[model samples]
Target: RIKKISIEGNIAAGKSTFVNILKQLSEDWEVVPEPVARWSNVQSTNGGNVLQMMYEKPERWSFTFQTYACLSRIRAQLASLNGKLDAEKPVLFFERSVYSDRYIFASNLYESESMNETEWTIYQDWHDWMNNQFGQSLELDGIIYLQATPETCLHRIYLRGRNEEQGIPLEYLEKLHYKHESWLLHRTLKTNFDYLQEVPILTLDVNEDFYESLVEKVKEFLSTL
Candidate 1:
């Protein structure tokens, strides 16, 4: 079977809803769920929220733990692989890919910080591995960017109704808007697209109604793929 397709975007990027639309549209489709939530309760026990960890000492350990959560999430996702696919009539779905794991940290606090020698080395190693690995997400012919204002992203996150995410600081997410600014310059989409070995992205327009627009826009991208 060829690699599976994945739909990825920032947190609260309407991935689940958009994916549901795909699932409903596909003649015979199945949804692959987000595995990152597996670490939710566990992550909180160690460090409940992203920003709260800064108040704790040994910040590197927190980063290491969070990184492990992402790794474990992706590892679990691929464990059920079987060499079978119907590319002729493919299964359409949304997913959280290992490919996106490396990139998501850009939204985390560590992105701007001056790292220690060990921290920098670890970060570099992870980035290198992501670039070299042939991930299913990269196999995907298109990506749905799920464009939204930062405020929209947070509002959707709150609507999800997760208790742990309650105190997610506004400043933290606000920082990400500033972050991807440099992401465009250094690790921007153009710079990072090469890491996917030439996989092209098809930005999903989300400037309108979340549910209805998601359905139509994903159809537009899938047609190109």
Candidate 2:
């Protein structure tokens, strides 16, 4: 049985908004909020490595970023698990997982100039450490991947203004979306995680159809699980 579900995609893929709609659609689950904004506000106020990563582009920088990204939400879910989460009926929703950012960043390995041999070693070691530390964090039965065009992404980003968003070139953003989508699908079908066992994958491309209607497909899959 699918106790928990996670939805992931590139920025402006309507991940957060989709979760909002999912909240009303599912009677059995509670949506777990994405911690990016919470961390972003604190990270930005304290001067996160967002811009520096763009400049330095170090491997450790990306690794550290991914670590923080995963830990915050995983830790929160742990708390919820101990407190409000019902083990009998584990139904939860997340906007993104630790996998999305790292998977996307790793996909564009050619673009990261700062990721030298030494940094790569350090990153791999740290990544393995984090994975072991946060073992089977969500135990999701299914994941819904959202896809959007680069133009759609840029349009959405332009509307949602933020300083970290500046210097976001369309060309780079397009490449990122490409890498993210490719890697996500690959992992889903490849059974990269030991936890998956033999669960099936469900992919949704929201580029053509209206998201309002597309969500019904997700509900249908969840029903099967």
Candidate 3:
């Protein structure tokens, strides 16, 4: 079976840049980017921009957006698995995973009171059930966590300057930073998902020049498996 890996990080943590560089480095990797385009113009909302709506009024749209985000990621993962795979490209790289949606984004919204208790419970129930149904297929062999300080993430987000991201506050990034740290580094968060604990994690500090270091780190990660 081909190795399945995910590139995980906060917003604007250089995931796309990392994937592009890896693409140039070798033909042995297949990359699936996040479904941002779909979120930008959701068909169910008559081509409404849910991503923008979520940012503008998070309390109103948090549950809706997070639910859709999880569904879209699941669809993407299934599509990638159903697609033709080549022996030449024995590695599959997902830009982000459904795991992040649950552990990071959804939890963040709930903790921030953007999502109410009832909404949070409903979302968790569905997410847990979906994992029960598809966890094996979605299992990751490894994770490349591009760790960055909240300050670095905030700076990069501003540099990218996406309209939806314009009003994102520093405190928001700090919250996300803590969530990523607890989940990936300290392993203090209880995900109720065992595979996450088993998967090998390559933590690269993106506060520095990660593009130069990631190549060697990824190679070293692949060699061990």
Task: Return the top candidate by TM-score.
Answer: 3
**lDDT score, candidate 2:** 0.64
Q: Please, what are the lDDT tens digits per residue for candidate 1 over residues 1-225?
A: 333456765567677777777777755455566754545434422434433333243354545644665566555444534422344656535476554555555225455452455674686578557546735343455455555556777887798866655565667566654443333323353334454545555556554554666567666766665
Which parts of model 2 are misplaced by more than 4 Å?
A: 43-63, 87-89, 106-111, 186-192, 195-197, 208-210
lDDT of each residue in 1-225, candidate 3, tens digit only:
778889989888888888778766666777888888899988753589999999999999999999999998888887887783666647878898888899899999999999999999999999999988988888899998988888888888888888899889899998998998898899887888876788888998878754666688897798776
- Which has the higher TM-score value, candidate number 2 or candidate number 3? 3
Better of 2 and 3 by lDDT: 3
Answer with 1 or 2, whichever has the higher lDDT: 2
Per-candidate Cα RMSD to the true structure, in Å, reads 4.6, 3.7, 1.7
Error of 3 at 75 (Å): 0.7
The list of candidate 1 runs beyond 4 A from truth reads: 1-3, 42-61, 83-87, 92-94, 106-108, 114-117, 130-138, 178-197, 207-209
Candidate number with the higher TM-score (1 or 3): 3
Pairs that collide, model 3: none
Model 1: weakest 10-residue lDDT segment is 49-58
- The lDDT values for all models are 0.54, 0.64, 0.86
Better of 1 and 3 by lDDT: 3
